[PDB]
Design a binder for this molecule. Structure first.
Ligand SMILES: Nc1ncnc2c1ncn2[C@@H]1O[C@H](COP(=O)(O)OP(=O)(O)OP(=O)(O)O)[C@@H](O)[C@H]1O
Ligand SMILES: Nc1ncnc2c1ncn2[C@@H]1O[C@H](COP(=O)(O)OP(=O)(O)O)[C@@H](O)[C@H]1O
Lengths: 445, 72, 874
């Protein structure tokens, strides 16, 4: 039954395929790893826990949740009674807006009822992962417990795992070799690097093979036991289809993004180094604006009209424009209206086509780039205007302090983004409805 | 037939009849059209045809067209 | 071996012109093979030598990079004319993009002609000699034309700083120099007004200026007309900018509006010519290349056009490539070309090996190269082209001076920028890592129409523009959206262009707009669409709608040709005549037997009777001749039939005074109309494979006659006029009458009187309606069956006419009725099963035998003449 469900997962998406040998090795891991008044139930429970802990990492968050709660549903179908099944199907139906009913009264079901009547779908749906499964593996546990050397860490857009990969490289005491792909000189450089590292050892990272699927098909399939040699083939979930025999011979790893907004500002500010006081203030304000618009990007059906990707090129363009505006101004009076129009129209509103998203971006720029004395970009923190009798270094210290002073509350997506809470509740309800509909489609067959 | 610019059948008494069996059998081109049936249409409607290697107009006078094709 | 000897002789003379008259292993092998051929296949060895001598050819091609755009054959043909100084200035438009020909006086270069023929006064003459190579004097001409443009810019700036009026300078110097002078004067005056808080004085000054330019436009003939309207577009732009700055409440809003629009500058401290003028848009700085571009049309300065110009300025400030994507018809490539022609560079448009060659040429010359329809490429060539453009771009940001492409050392220019436009219906990852995509919205057609009408001088501009754009929007909303229905900016510009020939006879006002809108939009609609169009034109326009001579000649020609003057036929003929009066490229759309060949033959005969002009008709079908038979292939050279008729109409005295009409009476294949893309537009030049440029007389009107438009690009629908036949132009009795007249032309009066009396319409309509409910194998209309019914009846009567003088009138009437019955049975329902034939007999008998006939004469039967054949076993 579990392999049938994983086969439907494999036929859903090109990156979600599963091999038979992978399943058999994962089942052997159950006996490698060393009670309900017996042994066979212990073996079955350890099978479920081990297959979760191994094949959770090859999915994104939504498929992780649906697979976890489907596995819990099958286990409780086998173990528990008929009224338990009726209660579980009642909650699945009321989560999918299909069948409404009351439980047929196990305090865990009581906490589940208290969670779902409070309209907290995310907690009521992470209840399965928090209760049934006790072990979770990150990327470090995957790379530390895999005999295979070729990894395919395919991360979706706006989510970058290269920083975590190089940080893990320091943690494993190894220097990574980042290789861009796309040009024939870089193709020959990558071929020479892998030819060196396949015999001399050393980790190596291959990135951005999306335009180089042709080279991948012509080389890697023909190319596919050395210590400290683990090559990574970073791909994209929304990109073109990777070759199936390459995917069958490589481990599958999916990365997940940071949920915070303050950490994005901290990362952008740390990545920014230099140039007057007003240039530093404009860079800080623009970093906050970029983090806010990237945070509002992910809320697809409510925050925006469709998915967009504001990469670092737009940040660089806006920073260069702010530098040119502040530099080519001998009066030291910042034209905030002109820079507001240019940011909302040309730099960040360039690829945006429809008018409502353009109005949203213009409203965000008016809220952020107004340049007032009392600038409350978020309710948490207050930003005062810079003075005139100082230098750059104390301003850098003050801005680092004002980042370190603030904290991110749990309602950041409703308070820091100027979005109504009912839209967030409807978004979470729609997500829960979609995942419950897909899991009942999986359960009915 | 013989050439005299008029195309003349060899028989000076009898009208030559051009048999065309299986008119549906020639294939359409890459852009949804046939060619030999258009040539026959030009031959029976404009009463002649244009020569390809000499770029000259040759008329027809007493050659008729018959067909024999299955329903499609 | 005559053809082989001709080929060897041609190879020998071409290689003589390449190297024999000029001054190691390849040359020695050539000299040995030439000596062997003179003493006596060596042509393959000569081709192998030319393949091996391509490296020297590539080096000579890269000596002067303008010659790189052309092909190998054209370049070697240019190089072979190294002493005659011929053919160099004829087909050089491919390397410059806007220069067609060069005039030379006393063996010296003194003038340059634009794409239309604008004569320019060069500052310095160029000496010419037989020892001077093509590349040296080509570089001299390039430097001379740039110097002439700069010194005319200096002269314009001096004469404008002297305080002289502009009506005396608009008629003697080039359009680029007065363009820059007007822009510089405008930005200086508005900046001096921005140092203070007044705008009314120079607003009134530029208002009187545009009034004077409008008067000069009304007094100008052709070239001055184009120049004055080109200047007047940006003069209205200056008036709009100053008026917008007038309504600004604060200083900050005025500064925003002034920084958003383009500003022009020059440096008075530097001394170089080509780098002394820079433009500033939203802070960034771009340098004016000072290149001549001819006199192309100016795009109407929409605010969204300025937004897009700011987008390209932002993209080019950091050496990124601008990218456009959006719905078709928003003017993206036109926006890129407007940016090029405003900043002063020619942009080589790519209609996207050869692409890589054009790419390396445009990145080695430093000019801009734009793209159109980027998504139609095949995957392999798309990947190769994308890799090439991304690697030259990565060379561009890195500051590299040379890049290695296709194993050659090609230098990288410090001014190369490449733009790509998209028509989704996308950009790959490698390109999106280094580009700046922008989404063009729907352009404001109201402002464009208002300004265009202000060039044309109509007394009502804003209300007329709003009315016409709302009317086009309502036609877009309230009509059946078929394939050929376009109601956007292209048709609006076509209507505003077609308003020009009617204003001299109809006068400026609303009625000319209504008449041209009718003559453009109405003949491309159906029947209910025609009713909706008429209702909307009556409702939204005040004008609800002297042609005695042309209608009388049309009626006379139709009556002598046997055709009937039905009201739909008359309407379609008048629409076709009024539509060929202005537009040259026309197509005919309609079902089989709709009356298209008849209507154009009728109007051509009426035109020959009325205007007295001779008419020569060349009927031709597209799909019955192949590609080589229509155009011509290089074996030597053979001329195709279309090129043959162009050759005998150009090279030929009667054809000059005669209107030669050609009709393409077949399906519109995409290949033939793509080969016709160079003549259906305003270029009017055949693009022969060998490079011959055959001229076309203005009376050479192209026609097309095609039933299905599913395999034709929408660009051809916009470029060429479309005539639609939604309904048949004939009554049925018209078909019988014309067929009877033609058959009589092909007791005779009594016979034709009885034939005409045998046809009565009241019962014929009912029997045709009843027969239309029958099943026809390979079903065709009864309108297409009378064609053989009438001919069969007339032939039977003409065959039996020999014994039609010794019988009574009742017997003759019985013979007439039997023969008409036989023809109607065999043609109207002569394609169905015998049971349905018996049903047809019963229906036609109850509305008025199966094998009844006349046997030589008596009413005998077929049963008395069948022979019982005697057959043997074998
Ligand atoms: N009063 C009439 N007006 C027009 N055509 C008439 C009239 N009476 C008879 N006809 C016949 O109708 C025919 C109409 O031909 P039409 O121009 O519609 O050709 P078509 O079937 O579209 O041709 P093609 O398929 O070759 O493009 C004429 O050739 C003529 O013989
Ligand atoms: N700002 C403008 N002012 C005047 N005309 C314009 C403007 N923008 C577009 N047009 C007109 O719109 C027409 C359609 O442009 P089109 O060729 O469809 O561009 P693309 O091929 O890039 O989509 C052009 O002929 C052009 O004359």
């Amino acid at each position: 039954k579990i392999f049938s469900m994983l086969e439907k997962f494999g036929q859903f998406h090109w990156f979600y395929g599963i091999s038979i040998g992978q399943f058999l090795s994962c089942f052997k891991r159950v006996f490698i790893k060393k009670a309900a008044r017996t042994r066979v139930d212990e073996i079955l429970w350890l099978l479920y826990q081990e297959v979760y802990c191994q094949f959770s990492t090859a999915l994104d968050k939504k498929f992780k949740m649906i697979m976890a709660m489907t596995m819990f549903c099958l286990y409780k179908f086998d173990i528990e009674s008929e009224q338990y099944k009726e209660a579980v199907l009642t909650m699945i139906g009321v989560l999918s807006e299909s069948s409404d009913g009351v439980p047929k009264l196990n305090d865990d079901l009581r906490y589940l009822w208290d969670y779902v009547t409070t309209k907290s779908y995310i907690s009521a749906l992470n209840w399965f992962k928090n209760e049934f499964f006790v072990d979770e593996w990150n990327i470090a546990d995957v790379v530390a417990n895999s005999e295979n050397n070729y990894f395919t860490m395919a991360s979706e857009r706006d989510v970058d795992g290269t920083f975590k990969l190089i940080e893990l490289a320091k943690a494993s005491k190894e220097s990574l070799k980042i290789i861009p792909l796309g040009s024939i000189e870089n193709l020959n450089y990558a071929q020479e690097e892998i030819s060196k590292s396949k015999i001399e050892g050393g980790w190596i990272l291959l990135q951005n093979i999306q335009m180089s699927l042709s080279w991948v098909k012509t080389y890697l399939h023909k190319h596919v036991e050395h210590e400290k040699f683990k090559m990574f083939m970073t791909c994209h979930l929304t990109g073109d289809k990777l070759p199936a025999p390459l995917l069958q011979r490589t481990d599958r790893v999916v990365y997940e993004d940071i949920p915070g907004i303050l950490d994005t500002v901290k990362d952008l500010w740390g990545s920014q180094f230099f140039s007057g006081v007003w240039s530093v203030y404009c860079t800080f304000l623009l970093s906050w604006f970029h983090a806010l618009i990237t945070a509002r990007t992910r809320l697809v059906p409510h925050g925006f009209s469709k998915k967009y990707y504001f990469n670092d090129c737009d940040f660089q363009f806006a920073s260069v424009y702010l530098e040119n505006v502040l530099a080519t101004n001998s009066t030291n009076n910042i034209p905030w209206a002109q820079v507001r129009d240019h940011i909302a129209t040309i730099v960040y509103g360039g690829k945006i086509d429809e008018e409502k998203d353009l109005e949203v971006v213009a409203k965000l720029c008016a809220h952020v780039f107004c340049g007032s004395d009392n600038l409350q970009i978020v309710p948490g923190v207050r930003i005062p205007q810079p003075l005139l009798q100082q230098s750059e270094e104390e301003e850098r210290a003050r801005l680092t302090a004002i980042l370190s002073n603030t904290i991110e509350p749990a309602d950041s997506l409703s308070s820091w983004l100027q979005l109504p809470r009912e839209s967030i509740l409807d978004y979470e309800r729609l997500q829960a409805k979609e995942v419950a509909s897909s899991t009942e489609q999986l359960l009915q067959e | 037939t013989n050439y005299v610019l008029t195309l003349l059948p060899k028989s000076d008494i009898k009208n030559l009849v051009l048999f065309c069996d299986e008119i549906n059998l020639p294939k359409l081109d890459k852009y949804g059209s046939q060619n030999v049936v258009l040539f026959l249409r030009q031959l029976m409607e404009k009463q002649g045809f244009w020569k390809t290697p000499e770029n000259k107009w040759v008329t027809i006078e007493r050659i008729h067209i018959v067909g024999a094709c299955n329903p499609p | 071996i005559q053809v082989n000897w001709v080929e060897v002789q041609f190879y020998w003379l071409d290689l003589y012109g390449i190297l024999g008259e000029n001054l190691p292993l390849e040359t020695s092998k050539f000299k040995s093979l030439t000596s062997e051929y003179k003493m006596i296949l060596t042509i393959d060895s000569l081709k192998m030598i030319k393949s091996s001598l391509s490296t020297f050819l590539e080096r000579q091609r890269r000596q002067f990079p303008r010659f790189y755009f052309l092909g190998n054959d054209d370049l070697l043909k240019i190089i072979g004319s190294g002493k005659h100084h011929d053919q160099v200035s004829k087909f050089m438009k491919k390397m410059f993009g806007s220069i067609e020909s060069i005039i030379f006086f006393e063996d010296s270069i003194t003038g340059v002609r634009s794409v239309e023929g604008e004569v320019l006064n060069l500052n310095e003459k160029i000496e010419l000699k037989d020892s001077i190579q093509a590349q040296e004097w080509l570089n001299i001409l390039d430097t001379e034309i740039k110097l002439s443009v700069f010194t005319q810019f200096r002269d314009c700036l001096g004469q404008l700083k002297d305080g002289t009026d502009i009506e005396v300078v608009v008629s003697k110097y080039i359009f680029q120099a007065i363009l820059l002078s007007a822009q510089v004067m405008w930005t200086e005056l508005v900046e001096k007004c921005l140092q203070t808080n007044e705008f009314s004085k120079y607003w009134k000054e530029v208002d009187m200026k545009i009034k004077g330019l409008l008067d000069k436009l009304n007094k100008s003939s052709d070239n001055v007309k184009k120049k004055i309207e080109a200047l007047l577009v940006e003069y209205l732009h200056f008036n709009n900018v100053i008026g917008q700055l007038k309504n600004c409440s604060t200083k900050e809003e005025a500064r925003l509006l002034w920084a958003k629009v383009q500003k022009f500058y020059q440096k008075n401290d530097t001394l170089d010519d080509l780098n002394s003028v820079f433009i500033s848009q939203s802070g960034y700085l771009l340098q004016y290349k000072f290149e001549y571009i001819g006199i192309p049309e100016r795009l109407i300065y929409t605010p969204l056009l300025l937004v897009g110009f700011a987008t390209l300025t932002d993209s080019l400030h950091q050496k990124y490539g601008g990218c456009f994507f959006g719905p078709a018809g928003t003017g993206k490539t036109e926006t890129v070309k407007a940016f090029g022609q405003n900043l002063g560079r020619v942009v080589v448009v790519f209609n996207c090996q050869v692409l890589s060659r054009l790419l390396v040429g445009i990145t080695q010359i430093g000019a801009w190269g734009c793209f159109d329809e980027f998504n139609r490429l095949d995957e392999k060539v798309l990947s190769a082209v994308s890799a090439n453009i991304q690697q030259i771009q990565n060379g561009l940001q890195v500051g590299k001076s040379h890049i290695t492409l296709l194993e050659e050392e090609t230098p990288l220019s410090p001014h190369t920028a490449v733009f790509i436009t998209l028509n989704p219906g996308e950009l790959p990852e490698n390109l999106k890592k280094s580009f700046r995509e922008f989404s063009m919205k729907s352009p404001q057609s109201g402002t464009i129409a208002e300004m265009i009408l202000q060039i044309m001088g109509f007394e009502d501009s804003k209300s007329l523009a709003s009315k016409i754009v709302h009317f086009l929007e309502l036609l877009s909303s309230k009509c059946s959206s078929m394939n050929h229905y376009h109601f956007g900016l292209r048709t609006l510009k076509g209507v505003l262009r077609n308003c020009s020939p009617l204003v001299s006879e109809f006068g400026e006002g609303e009625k000319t707009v209504v008449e041209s809108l009718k003559r453009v939009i109405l003949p491309s609609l159906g029947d209910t669409d025609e009713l909706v169009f008429k209702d909307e034109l009556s409702k939204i326009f005040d004008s609800a709608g002297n042609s005695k001579a042309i209608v009388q000649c049309l009626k006379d020609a139709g009556q002598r040709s046997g055709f009937s003057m039905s009201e739909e036929f008359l309407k379609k003929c008048m629409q076709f005549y009024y539509m060929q009066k202005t537009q040259q490229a026309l197509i005919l759309v309609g079902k089989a037997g709709c009356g298209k060949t008849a209507t154009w033959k009728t109007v051509i005969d009426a035109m020959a009777i009325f205007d007295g002009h001779a008419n020569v008709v060349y009927v031709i079908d597209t799909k019955v001749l192949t590609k080589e038979s229509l155009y011509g292939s290089m074996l030597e050279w053979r001329d195709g039939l279309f090129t043959s008729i162009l050759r005998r109409v150009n090279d030929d005295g009667t054809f000059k005074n005669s209107r030669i009409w050609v009709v393409f009476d077949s399906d519109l294949d995409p290949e033939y109309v793509e080969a016709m893309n160079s003549v259906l537009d305003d270029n009017k030049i055949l693009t022969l494979p060998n490079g011959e440029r055959l001229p076309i007389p203005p009376n050479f009107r192209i026609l097309f006659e095609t039933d299905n438009l599913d395999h034709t690009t929408p660009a051809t629908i916009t470029r060429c006029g479309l005539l639609w036949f939604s309904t048949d132009v004939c009554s049925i009795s018209s078909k019988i009458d014309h067929l009877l007249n033609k058959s009589y032309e092909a007791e005779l009066d009594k016979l034709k009187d009885l034939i005409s009396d045998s046809f009565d319409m009241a019962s014929l309509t009912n029997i045709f309606t009843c027969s239309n409910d029958l099943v026809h194998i390979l079903g065709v209309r009864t309108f297409n069956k009378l064609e053989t019914a009438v001919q069969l009846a007339v032939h039977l009567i003409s065959s039996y006419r020999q014994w039609f003088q010794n019988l009574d009138d009742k017997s003759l009437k019985d013979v007439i009725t039997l023969l008409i019955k036989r023809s109607l049975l065999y043609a109207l329902a002569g394609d169905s099963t015998g049971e349905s034939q018996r049903a047809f007999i019963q229906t036609i008998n109850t509305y008025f035998s199966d094998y009844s006939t006349i046997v030589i004469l008596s009413f005998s039967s077929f049963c008395s003449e069948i022979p019982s054949v005697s057959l043997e076993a074998h």
